[PDB]
């Protein structure tokens with residue numbers, strides 16, 4: 001692509017928008033930037049020479065643009081952005097800009113849960129093989145910052161939002177790990193509209209890696225000659241369970257006894273399968289890929305033990321921003337005493353009812369906070385308490401914690417109503433756990 005001389009308008013003054021500003025300036029194009037927020041976070045980091053507009057979308061700028069670059073946080077359905085599309089003005093996102101420039105193969109990963117773990121695993125498999133790898137996207141390092149003529153493989157975590165604005169991705173290997181309700185505040189045509197965004201990841205992919213146990217991860221025309229599957233009891237990549245022992249298997253052959261992994265839980269074993277399938281499709285050597293599965297210890301804020309003291313584990317699962325992610329934490333969870341479960345934040349219009357079946361019995365207490373705290377407490381009112389904030393909830397539960405108990409922050413909601421992001425929520429939880437638990 002050649003952007004010289006074009007009128008380029010960027011929407012969003014977050015991490016993505018700032019990376020796009022730098023991308024265009026480095027190519028001799030001065031963009032303009034706007035954001036609907038009155039005081040967006042990147043305002044102070046924006047170079048002084050770049051014109052900016054805040055507090056609304058500016059139609060004078062959008063309707064004059066040759067190219068609109070939309071951050072994932074702005075809906076294409078915004079009336080001003082929809083008006084620009086109606087006029088035939090080209091709209092792309094940062095991932096599109098990246099794909100147009102990338103000079104190495106791309107592994108592309110989406111899904112409602114597991115995507116950062118799988119993305120990081122594939123990156124570790126590449127590193128173990130001695131491959132110069134760039135890992136980024138929705139995981140938190142904007143993709144345009146990865147561009148490097150020495151990079152030999154890119155591994156991108158992609159959201160549904162990013163995929164909506166991407167048209168030129170031709171992944172060497174692509175997966176949808178699973179599809180469960182999320183972002184319904186952005187998808188007024190429901191689960192299938194969200195799914196449709198994710199299905200874009202398979203377009204022009206050389207290999208598609210699908211979940212044999214989740215039919216919504218399959219292309220609408222069905223699985224085809226490009227499709228490799230993973231699953232629990234079936235799939236090209238699957239699990240074999242025996243007497244307290246689980247193996248990763250590929251087409252009937254054992255490849256790894258999961259006792260060698262540092263992650264645990266069935267969903268992390270299927271994450272390992274998906275990562276291996278992607279790595280195999282990208283041509284990475286099997287032996288080094290298996291080694292990486294044994295060295296990876298997990299991501300911050302993803303079922304992370306932040307304190308184990310006095311017989312109590314305090315677990316930061318702040319990255320559980322949807323119901324399916326909290327279900328993965330709860331399903332199969334063993335607690336000797338009482339589970340003190342922190343739920344709350346901005347639920348994004350989700351139905352929380354799938355969580356109720358994990359919340360029966362006498363050894364569970366709920367502490368519900370944030371915007372949707374009342375809806376979460378309604379899952380089982382007789383064991384639930386509601387506060388405004390997570391700190392209030394933690395100070396309420398801490399006196400009740402007994403040896404053998406678990407305190408689990410797995411909130412099923414976004415943090416943006418009260419926190420900068422899920423990392424700040426997790427860091428605040430960890431600080432409070434250390435104060436209250438030691």
Ligand SMILES: CC(=O)N[C@H]1[C@@H](OP(=O)(O)OP(=O)(O)OC[C@H]2O[C@@H](n3ccc(=O)[nH]c3=O)[C@H](O)[C@@H]2O)O[C@H](CO)[C@@H](O)[C@@H]1O[C@H](C)C(=O)N[C@@H](C)C(=O)O
Nearest residue numbers: 012014015016035036037071072073137138139140142159
């Ligand atoms: C919301 C989203 O898609 N965030 C991803 C984005 O971060 P960035 O800081 O660029 O976000 P953004 O596009 O500026 O939007 C952030 C917030 O600002 C709001 N916003 C944005 C632009 C605007 O004009 N008005 C406005 O109100 C959005 O509604 C959103 O709540 O780009 C980063 C780099 O690719 C990602 O790491 C980050 O993923 C975060 C982790 C995330 O929450 N992603 C969602 C999709 C998820 O995982 O569920």
Ligand SMILES: CC(=O)Nc1ccc(Sc2ccc3nnc(N)n3n2)cc1
Nearest residue numbers: 077188189190191192193194195196197
């Ligand atoms: C079998 C099934 O459920 N298929 C399906 C596929 C896509 C959608 S999403 C959609 C549908 C209409 C529409 N009109 N305008 C917009 N933006 N949309 N989006 C829903 C259902």
